[PDB]
Write a protein that binds this ligand. Structure first.
Ligand SMILES: Nc1ncnc2c1ncn2[C@@H]1O[C@H](COP(=O)(O)OP(=O)(O)OP(=O)(O)O)[C@@H](O)[C@H]1O
Ligand SMILES: Nc1ncnc2c1ncn2[C@@H]1O[C@H](COP(=O)(O)OP(=O)(O)OP(=O)(O)O)[C@@H](O)[C@H]1O
Ligand SMILES: Nc1ncnc2c1ncn2[C@@H]1O[C@H](COP(=O)(O)OP(=O)(O)OP(=O)(O)O)[C@@H](O)[C@H]1O
Ligand SMILES: [K+]
Lengths: 48, 346, 335, 335
């Protein structure tokens, strides 16, 4: 974005409402699930 | 406009609004298409095609010389010497396997890859017996370096031409004619989108018309220039904001004759060609547009596109061709010029 | 107390702002254009990042690839050679670790090739990934090489350095007024076919209703053949007289203290060694021009050779001047 | 002594001293810039020195790196058999000297990789050195390739050749004065879109008491359409006629010795072989201005093909003429 032909200012939300619901919650949940898997893995690895 | 509907072909459009030179050359002395032409087409390809030709060329060279190596390792009685499984390889040492451990075309192909791209896995080296193999190795390396250099040149030249993206110079799709400062004026709007400036800019306005001559000759497509009416007679122009490039006509220019009714049947066509060199690239660019009689919405006047924002001017580009139909005199091109007794025919 | 918006900021760099431009778009090829012109700091990192990425990616395509054809197991179970002979089906000889695989990866996309990891011809998928890795390596290598050459080609041109004096003056030469800035030069090479143009920006109504909002007239400069060329070695003083034809002709002694004027000056030309066109812009708002003081001499004949002095680039001294307007001074002899 | 300082020396150069300006600071980019534009008697030297320095430095690093991990000791003690060098424990295999390590470094840098000096995945630090040296090697290779290609692209840009004359001749021509000189060309190419300019430098003190130390007045060049372009195949005779309003209008026709004057000629063009702009220039001081002499016809048909000989390029012939400035030619019909 350092050289192009567009409105220079940074202001947008093109199709965000059905995607904000998607990512912002989905990734966090996903990051939560990845944390959970990390926990299960670490404790299991200590066990084995 | 059913007459125009059947007259869609009959049309005085010397250059299409896109900018191309809609014409037709024929009866020319086409000498041919010499070889080097193809190479030039190699330079001006697009990325998908360039990548395809690149990869295909490398693979074709590898496979071809692999086939050659396969024949070579065949003729020297090498494949048989390996195929003799009396031992792991009973008599495969003295027989001077022409290329060490080349068993089948797949293996020879692995060797071709290993010798062209300078990998060299060592497990399969050229030996000191067969001069033919050495000849083919020399040929392999020479052709490899030439192909490598040519393909590198192609890819580089498609990289060094990344400054060029697209010419973006914008005209008012329509013209405008009006009265300003006491006399008839011809207008047009010119704007730019690129951030970079255009140095040493210049414009030229020409009338294309079919002419007649008192001596008797007729020049079918006659071109004549017209002044560009700047304050001190100079075809220079500074382009920060878009503006209105007005070529007002008095007598010498061919606008004295213009009658308002005649515009539909008018045969004159205005062409605009402007050019300049781009500051940050170094390329001389030239943009051309055509003003046909059907697009000259007479009598109008142009709109204003500059507003005071907070401390910095704001500019619109939506309102380019929008005009407010300010009242103007009619067909005064000769009446007002050849001043009547009133000397104020308007 | 904000300054009325200026068309060209005093340090060049035209500060306009046009919007509602139809977003042309963001061409897929645009990243490459942006990629070509980077600070050397980045093009010495994106190099490393691209190479290291490609290496690691093909390595992972590769440690796993050694496992699938049975390579990891033969070496591990017994001795590599003491207990048993080779399985002989190893895809790449002696490729022991997802560490060893990474090491092997370095040979294919970097063209070094050690030899202790040969490529057997059994596993066809291995041959497929070898072709693919080699092609990608060549394409990445060529693109990076072209980028490095572009940023070594443009090490000659650096920056426009053409210096105008801070503010203008207005004085009298041969019983008539004038207007002066002071252009100059810095580096060794002269400019070629350098040209100068003076434009005045103003809000012009028209006697027929139309009011051009920000309208730019061009005015002639002074030269004895009325030609805009110039040739500079030491700073010159490019006057542009004011007369009945000129637009500044209605300026006044008091009115310039609160006035709507904008005299931009543009200078074009090339540079001999680089052979590249260039231009430079700057200005003079109403606040910036102070009447009656001409500039000060520069060239001094030293004992040996001429000397051009910069210590007083923009220095000014007052001198006699009448306070009337241009039309006032030429209004009448007795006037 | 007493030599009045010439503005630009007769042999094509500019000689006005740059004094007292601030120091912009030698930015680091200048170093690379000066690497780019070198003559070939240094480029190959720096090239080779850079390669050798990189090779030797990384070889020393490998030797140290086969030191701390005790490879070197191990190779030395077990001379009789070596037991496969302790199952190749050493981080770099088969390196067991410095010179041998140097050979290994040459192998890795220049992409040879013989094979006896295999590298194992035994110790990480060795892998780190391999990656580091590899990437640095690629950068040095790319930089030097860029240098050599930049030099290759400037083969045509070689030097400047434009043959002026050491003598300006003021002889009469078509019922007036003139100040002619001869302009030549050596290379087979024809300069596209050439232009000529003539400037006069002398001290002047303006009527309003302002003095201007030097002051470039311009003078028109004669051309029947007043066009400064020109078409230079043969030698040509530029002639800047002396109208009533020209600066040279009051010369001391035969007391033209103690006169504070200088004439500068500048020729601009672009060469149709490269496309590079170029410019030549020169100056005539008072002492190098023959009077009354006119230039000598050169162009001579030889055998039906036009011949031009430079043997008589810039030699003049004395021919009687009036001896009074044009003003002394303008007062009366017969003065
Ligand atoms: N903001 C803008 N963005 C892109 N193009 C523009 C813009 N303003 C004007 N143009 C171009 O100017 C040309 C003529 O514009 P005009 O003055 O007719 O406005 P218009 O009637 O909206 O144009 P059009 O009918 O083509 O949309 C068109 O080809 C258009 O491409
Ligand atoms: N030695 C110099 N080198 C380059 N530029 C200079 C030098 N001296 C003055 N200038 C120019 O003068 C302009 C303004 O200078 P600045 O205001 O910093 O000093 P000043 O004396 O207050 O102004 P000025 O120097 O114009 O009288 C700047 O654009 C700068 O380029
Ligand atoms: N044969 C020639 N070819 C090209 N240039 C020439 C030739 N002869 C003279 N000139 C140019 O003319 C200029 C001055 O000529 P002048 O009449 O002074 O003869 P000159 O300089 O004594 O000749 P030379 O330079 O051989 O001593 C020199 O700069 C030289 O470059
Ligand atoms: K280039």
């Amino acid at each position: 974005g350092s050289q192009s032909s567009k409105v220079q200012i940074h202001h947008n939300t093109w199709l965000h409402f059905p995607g904000h619901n998607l990512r912002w919650i989905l990734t966090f949940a996903l990051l939560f699930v990845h944390v959970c898997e990390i926990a299960e893995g670490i404790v299991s690895d200590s066990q084995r | 406009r059913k007459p125009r509907i059947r007259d869609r072909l009959p049309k005085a459009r010397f250059i299409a609004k896109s900018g191309a030179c809609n014409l037709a050359h024929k009866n020319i002395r086409e000498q041919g298409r010499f070889l080097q032409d193809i190479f030039t087409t190699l330079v001006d390809l697009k990325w998908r095609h360039t990548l395809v030709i690149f990869t295909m060329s490398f693979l074709c060279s590898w496979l071809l010389f692999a086939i050659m190596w396969w024949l070579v390792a065949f003729a020297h009685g090498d494949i048989y010497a390996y195929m003799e499984k009396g031992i792991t390889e009973k008599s495969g040492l003295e027989s001077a396997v022409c290329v060490t451990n080349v068993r089948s075309f797949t293996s020879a192909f692995l060797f071709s890859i290993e010798v062209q791209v300078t990998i060299g896995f060592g497990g399969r080296m050229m030996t000191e017996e067969c001069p033919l193999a050495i000849t083919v190795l020399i040929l392999q390396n020479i052709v490899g370096l030439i192909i490598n250099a040519v393909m590198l040149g192609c890819i580089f030249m498609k990289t060094a031409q990344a400054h060029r993206r697209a010419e973006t110079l914008i005209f008012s799709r329509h013209a405008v004619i009006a009265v300003r400062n006491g006399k008839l004026c011809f207008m047009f709007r010119v704007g730019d989108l690129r951030k970079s400036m255009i140095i040493s800019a210049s414009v030229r306005i020409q009338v294309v018309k079919k002419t007649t001559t008192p001596e008797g000759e007729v020049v079918p497509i006659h071109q004549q220039d017209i002044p560009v009416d700047n304050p001190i007679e100079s075809n220079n122009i500074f382009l920060v904001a878009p503006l209105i490039i007005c070529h007002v006509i008095d007598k010498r220019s061919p606008l004295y004759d213009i009658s308002a009714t005649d515009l539909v049947n008018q045969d004159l066509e205005v062409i605009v060609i402007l050019e300049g060199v781009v500051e940050t690239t170094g390329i001389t660019t030239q943009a051309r547009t055509s003003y046909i009689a059907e697009e000259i919405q007479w009598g109008h006047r142009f709109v204003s596109i500059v507003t005071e924002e907070e401390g910095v001017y704001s500019v619109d580009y939506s309102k380019f061709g929008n005009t407010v139909r300010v009242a103007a005199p009619r067909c005064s091109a000769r009446e007002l010029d050849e001043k009547p007794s009133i000397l104020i025919q308007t």
